[PDB]
Paper text:
Ribosome recycling by the twin‐ATPase ABCE1 is a key regulatory process in mRNA translation and surveillance and in ribosome‐associated protein quality control in Eukarya and Archaea. Herein, the conserved and essential ATP‐binding cassette (ABC)‐type twin‐ATPase ABCE1 plays the key role for Archaea and Eukarya (Pisarev et al, 2010; Barthelme et al, 2011; Shoemaker & Green, 2011). In concert with the A‐site factor, ABCE1 splits the pre‐SC into the small (SSU) and large (LSU) ribosomal subunit. ABCE1 additionally possesses an essential N‐terminal iron–sulfur cluster domain (FeSD) (Barthelme et al, 2007) and a composite hinge region, which comprises a hinge 1 stretch between the NBDs and a hinge 2 stretch at the C terminus, and connects the two NBDs.
Author numbering:
A (entry chain Q): 1 to 56
B (entry chain M): 1 to 102
C (entry chain L): 67 to 132
D (entry chain V): 2 to 150
E (entry chain T): 1 to 64
F (entry chain C): 1 to 193
Amino acid sequence: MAKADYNKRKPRKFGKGARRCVRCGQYGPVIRVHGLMLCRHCFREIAPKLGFKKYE
Amino acid sequence: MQKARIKLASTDIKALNEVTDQIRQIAERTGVRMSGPIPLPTKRIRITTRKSPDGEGTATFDKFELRVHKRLVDIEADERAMRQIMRIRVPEDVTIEIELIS
Amino acid sequence: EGGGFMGQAEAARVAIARALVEWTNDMNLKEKFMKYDRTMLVGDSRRTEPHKPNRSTKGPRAKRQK
Amino acid sequence: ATVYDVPGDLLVERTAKALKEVEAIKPPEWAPFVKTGRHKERIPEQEDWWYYRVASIFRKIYIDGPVGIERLRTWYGGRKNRGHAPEHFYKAGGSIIRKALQQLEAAGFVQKVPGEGRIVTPQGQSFLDRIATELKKELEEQLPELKKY
Amino acid sequence: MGNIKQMFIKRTARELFDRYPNEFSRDFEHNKKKVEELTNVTSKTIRNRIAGYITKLVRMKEEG
Amino acid sequence: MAIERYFIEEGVREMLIDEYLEKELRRAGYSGIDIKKTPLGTKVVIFAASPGYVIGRGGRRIRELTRILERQFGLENPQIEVEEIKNPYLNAKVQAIRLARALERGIHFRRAAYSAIRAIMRNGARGVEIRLSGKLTGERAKSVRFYQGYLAKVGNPAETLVSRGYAQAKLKLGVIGVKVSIMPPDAKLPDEI
RNA sequence: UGGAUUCAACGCCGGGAACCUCACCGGGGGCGACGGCAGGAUGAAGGCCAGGCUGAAGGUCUUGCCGGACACGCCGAGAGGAGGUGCAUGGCCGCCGUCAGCUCGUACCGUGAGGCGUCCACUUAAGUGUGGUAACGAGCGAGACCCGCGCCCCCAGUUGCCAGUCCUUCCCGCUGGGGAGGAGGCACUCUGGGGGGACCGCCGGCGAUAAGCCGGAGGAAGGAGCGGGCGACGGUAGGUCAGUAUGCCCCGAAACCCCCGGGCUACACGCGCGCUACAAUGGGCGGGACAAUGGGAUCCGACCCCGAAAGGGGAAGGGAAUCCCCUAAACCCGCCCCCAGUUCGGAUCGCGGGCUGCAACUCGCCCGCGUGAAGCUGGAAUCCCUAGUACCCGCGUGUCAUCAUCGCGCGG
Ligand SMILES: [Mg+2]
Ligand SMILES: [Mg+2]
Ligand SMILES: [Mg+2]
Ligand SMILES: [Mg+2]
Ligand SMILES: [Mg+2]
Ligand SMILES: [Mg+2]
Ligand SMILES: [Mg+2]
Ligand SMILES: [Mg+2]
Ligand SMILES: [Zn+2]
């Protein structure tokens, strides 16, 4: 078994694969408006804990 | 005499007011000339998510908001005043920044 | 220093009406204005209603078609 | 009398006609060709459009002071028919207005602050105010409620 | 549409009127000040609704 | 670094800390934390109901914990200390977790819920509500609300005064959701004394 | 590849997919923690020089290579699974429904299930209230509450504003007037903290004299001022295990992980929502005007230069009331067109020139010349909307390396 390991975690720099939620790890609907990186779901779950309020 | 800008920002008007009152009362404890807590435009970080995971059903949105209140205070720069405004408590949910105009 | 040519024109109308009244102290004139167009001296308070989700770009009540 | 006292379009055409008598206001060799912007569809239909354009720019620099090419680009831009697609605003080309500004700096009407754009000269504002007082007279034959000003 | 004094407004007004009747005038402004120095409210519209209700109660009493 | 960036960063970091500790100190009634960046270092304070459990065996736990803190999360110099909830029976996430812990022990849900309700309303709450939702009483799932006292649901006074807590009870056959809402002895608008 | 199919699927899954995303296809390569089993390091578990295969690969290999070191060659037992199950669950969402309902304590009625209250009449947006009443009281919900807008006062005056004052300077000239920069100061505007103000309060009428409705006055505001947020008990095996969490079943060295390429972008057709139009209530050309919301670090980028354009080079300032994005379009003035498949319409296609990116064929966006498709107002039927609303106009932002006929918002 003389070989070479080939998982190759490729470092994307732009793309839906480049960005990943820091909580769940989802790749698409990620919030990045003011330095966030969060899936819309997670954000809706935790926004109060961050201080976001729902007065409208 | 060269002046000192103090830009301070928070999410709580009351902590903000506490700090400004600290500064007012300390300047008048001494006699250095304050420039009022000029209130700057407050930042409304708005994030309009859809509140549904399913993608099914009527589309409904959560408009979440974070508010950052901002004040600036100009006070003449003295070593005394500077030492004590450094000694200020500056609670946890507040940022400050002492620039100096010279 | 504002929105549109009509809004500017109305704001100017208001401003100069008030100017004339406060320059002259003539209440017969004030009443002439207030019966021609009360909004000449009092302002129009109306503003635009915030747009709401369903086809929000169009309006607060403008809605998508079913 | 002055630019603010008279209207704009009349002044622009009159001062264009007068700018034809200036030698540093030659059109460039690519004028009879090109449009004024991507937002346009067709060549200018006039032959003296160059003079009309530099007249307009001259007046704009009178009014708005230390201004440059990008600001003027967004003023000379406009709406585009994007086909079946909806309409949007697009800026104009810069070469027309640049060559114009350079012609005017040659003729002596504008100068070029190192930063913050270009500024009308005394001889330039004299030129414009002369044409304006002239025009004001010719339409004071009409409105005496404008003779007032 | 519909502007109707709710139950707690009405109850509070009636109790105040019975407990301190000759303190409440026929003046809305005075009645306002009085409810405010009396009951804790912290709410202008509530204060004003209560004041209006005791105002017209006073009136109905003067009428019988 | 802009200022809103700073606020956002602090909130997100703290939220992830809170998540981790919620996972790891659920036996301890972990109510929450607070964080201050003193000059000598960043000192944090864990509010929980069993500091005995969070310290473990002579500071073992806080030690590996602070290691995790400075490593996995950007922290200058962690200075963990510990404190209690002054009235945990008025706190509602600690109670939700205690209830989930009970249901996992195997206690029947009616008994556990009514025990917790009795405890809270004796420890002095104006109101309490408890929803248990899931595979209770067989394979088809249902929801049961146990309530006592006086509790508001809607409005800013609800959003502020009542304390809400949520927990999962991971049992053999699946999850039981535990919602708890506690209204303490404090007053609302239409009182008007 | 899938999910969703009346309301409540079909510009929805923030679903604007070049790779990734991805779950589909063709091919290629890695993965057993813990134990034990075949063994054992003897120089190798593992990496590895030049090449052949290979799409390309120390993947593999004859040929050889050592930096100093254990075990899928075998079992269990697993890690991970965007694999199945949303009729196994949680959480969230939608709908019933921002509807006005849901209940309780005591009393009474009834053998009882249950009833009453919670009914009737007026009234209200409202089980909101008035009155009558075996009901009296209460609670959740509604309302109160929170956010914003609009008028006033106080405070505050920077990065905001510039009227007044002074200074300096440039033009017209009819010697009258206009602008610019400095101190000046917060006047005006504006900003943002705290207060006030509106309560059917006053007059009159209707209803019953009540609840309240209406008209009017005055007022910034007049009838919950306007607009939002907070969505009760509960149901809907509604949707979501393809966001996370989670039971069971399954894969488990493949149904786990990574890479290349393709696909999701195919098209005889049916449907939904929309964009552009079918012209004069206009098209083109040239001139003239007037916004707000928001956003900016490898990011906005003024300003200068180059270029016909798209775009290119350099670059002040700006971590945000300081700088920039940002002089909007509809509108107006003048000139051409004068009711026609047209100077309407811009499908399509050819040539060329560019930007992003590792990659632009499949399959991106932009520019220029050229081409010049249907379409001349639309049956049955159907949708949205009550005031700064609808219609019309453009702008911002989210998505974003580049891509907006979309979403959320902004003003005119
Ligand atoms: Mg009922
Ligand atoms: Mg409410
Ligand atoms: Mg009111
Ligand atoms: Mg279901
Ligand atoms: Mg189903
Ligand atoms: Mg055409
Ligand atoms: Mg025709
Ligand atoms: Mg979309
Ligand atoms: Zn997430």
